[PDB]
Symmetry: D2
Subunit: 248 residues, 4 copies
């Protein structure tokens, strides 16, 4: 009788915080991961010790290819195989790196458009076809319109994800599936980023001059899936401490 959720890229960072929070709210969770096998199984162990048989892992490369549909179909099936249901999909996995206009370009396209947009489209297709408070939450980007220089493919992927969010909200509304987004500004900074670079970004945030915690992101996801957002579809909630309001 407990609902079940899929969170993609859930081994670590924001995805983990979302799977933890959904699990604390009473969901059964599929922890999807790609390379972070040890971190995924560790998380699943932690959740299962809290309530047995409530977390499973599922490995998949979400790069675009001719087998991406089957991989997306398999992630959703994993939720139905473990739990008998799939109530919520959180499209959280993301590739993020520069692609200057001035890895083959075709691999960059597949990872950056694949993970950020095509895999959410296919997961959304599979989640809908395999079908109560059903919804999807896409992890978007509050700075989509003021993009980092030399990030065109990543920015294109996140814009396409805004498109998907709106299109799928429209199309799936008659089936009672809501589709919303959460758009972080700066949250957990890159592990490879030096402290001095971190602090440059921190200093730009009006609300408290610091990045969002992973939990702060997850809070907005939890709202969107809850009974308190039952009329909300096609909405993208920024969780950016005002960063997107700040001019150059």
């Amino acid at each position: 009788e407990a609902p079940a959720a899929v969170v993609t890229g859930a081994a670590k960072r924001i995805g983990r915080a979302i799977a933890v929070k959904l699990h604390q709210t009473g969901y059964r969770v599929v922890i999807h991961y790609h390379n972070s096998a040890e971190a995924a199984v560790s998380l699943a162990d932690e959740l299962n010790k809290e309530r047995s048989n409530t977390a499973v892992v599922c490995q998949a490369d979400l790069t675009n290819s001719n087998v991406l549909p089957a991989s997306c179909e398999e992630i959703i099936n994993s939720c139905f195989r473990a739990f008998g249901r799939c109530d919520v999909l959180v499209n959280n996995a993301s590739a993020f790196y520069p692609t200057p206009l001035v890895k083959t370009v075709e691999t960059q396209v597949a990872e950056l458009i694949g993970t950020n947009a095509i895999a959410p489209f296919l997961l959304t297709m599979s989640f809908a076809q395999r079908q109560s408070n059903l919804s999807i939450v896409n992890l978007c980007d509050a700075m989509v319109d003021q993009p980092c220089m030399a990030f065109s493919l990543y920015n294109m992927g996140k814009h396409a994800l805004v498109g998907l969010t709106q299109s799928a909200a429209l199309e799936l509304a008659p089936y009672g599936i809501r589709v919303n987004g959460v758009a972080p500004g700066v949250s957990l900074l890159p592990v490879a980023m030096g402290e001095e670079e971190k602090d440059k970004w921190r200093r730009k945030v009006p609300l408290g001059r610091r990045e969002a915690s992973a939990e702060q992101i997850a809070d907005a996801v939890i709202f969107l899936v809850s009974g308190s957002a039952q009329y909300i579809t096609g909405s993208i909630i920024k969780v950016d401490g005002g960063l997107s309001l700040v001019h150059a």
Copy 2:
């Protein structure tokens, strides 16, 4: 120890539901009203019966005039006089009626621009000057696809978007968050014939029904909560996908 909130136009409909849910959440409330005295008083009595001394009413006309700043200062002051603190301001009161391009026009300007934008700005000023603090402005999900011949109403709601953004930016250093909730079709006019209500209800993708006032209130409750501590300058549509629907 309990926080306090001001809700403008709180006697009826959406404002009432906001006031109720804030009260249920543990807030003391100033129920602002303009003409609906008997409804505002009945709400305050209902709330005070639940928890003594947790609701007061405050009457004020929020039409723009040279007395508006003093009116808006008095509303915020009443919250401090009643409760010793003011944690939350909800700018909900609104005039809404058509102003075709083809009451004097200056009265229309004072009502539609004053209630929807100037009074929120003056209230926001008074709230900040007197300081989990936050302001929620009731915006309009259809602001970019507006009702025909509603130009002043639409200008006031666009201005409120600007206020939401400008005040989030300027008040973030004081730890005051500023957000909006943007209904699509929520509670319909009482007099509107069912056949007309149904024309609008049928356009809504999610459930072919309008939002209840409580569903609008739920987004306000989220925004003022510890769960939105990092959210400022955001406007959450609560519209069942209505604004995504093309002509």
Copy 3:
């Protein structure tokens, strides 16, 4: 036979460059002004030297008041008085100054909301009522969603002006009146501003690291009034060298 245009705040700076370019294009012009009497008359003299009887001035305060509707009515009337028609309204006049949240406030409201929004609405009403290629161009602000801090009332007026542009495009389209906007980022900087602060802003602009000329702004106005924009209504053209794309 020559069309006629009203330009508000046309004595100086951007509105003057609009008036000039409209006149160069074949229009007869009403040069509206408030305080810049010598500048206004001097402009009308220059245009009239070039084609006699093609320019008049019209004085008015565009601050909100109970007589504002009459003043806006009189501006439109002046165009019909001088030229027998009124084909184009350019809403260019603007008050701009800070109003920190933390002159009386009701004067600030009257000025910043009156000039930027109410006078445009009233001028639009008067234009439409007194009524080919008819159109209205509103001067907006490309930075409306990334506001200068402490400019709430200004930013509110300009957001209202976007609402007006869309509402009036919708309502006046059946009358053949197109309604569009032109949104400068940094163009001619304040007389009062120090050269160091001017260079700070110029440095932020991606395209050329400089402010827009007034003529670059006028060029977009000229497009939107022309026969090459006959299917364009409700659009706002940013003329800001990419400034609004730049993150904090």
Copy 4:
């Protein structure tokens, strides 16, 4: 001397009107085509009869694949081969069809995202890499935020194209390359009746007019902007 432009999907409809108008303004043009060879050539004949050796054709499939980057590089190369320069890129080519959520799906991806967004990105890269009034114009969609039901992949591609427009305007501004969009609405009678401005479709020429403005010296300060050419349609509530 005379500037040169590449227009993708230039054989018919909006891209043809665009090539014609740029040619009338004094550009030399590369008329790109996929399937419409006879049309591309007929247009080329009409422009060269007007002014000899000012119009060439270029065949390429703009579907995403392992060979798309070569194809896009070759389109830009064709401009430089024929004309010695490439001043203007118009990304007009587009695939358009529904992809319900409830051709393999990955061929749909390749066409809807490849032609509408990835080709524009690779063409932008090639245009920029090969470089006094340089600009790119992307043909966007005025209804991007109020999409047709069951057109998710198309809509995703057009959103990605908005992102490309903004990212490339930012990144290429230092090179003096401006990057802007034109967003048509409708350019059958059911639709035309909804249009506030005279309840008719945009002609292709009205779309071309906005392109012509954006590439002109009257737009030398405009970058990152998307001009709706939709008769007000995007303003109309449901």
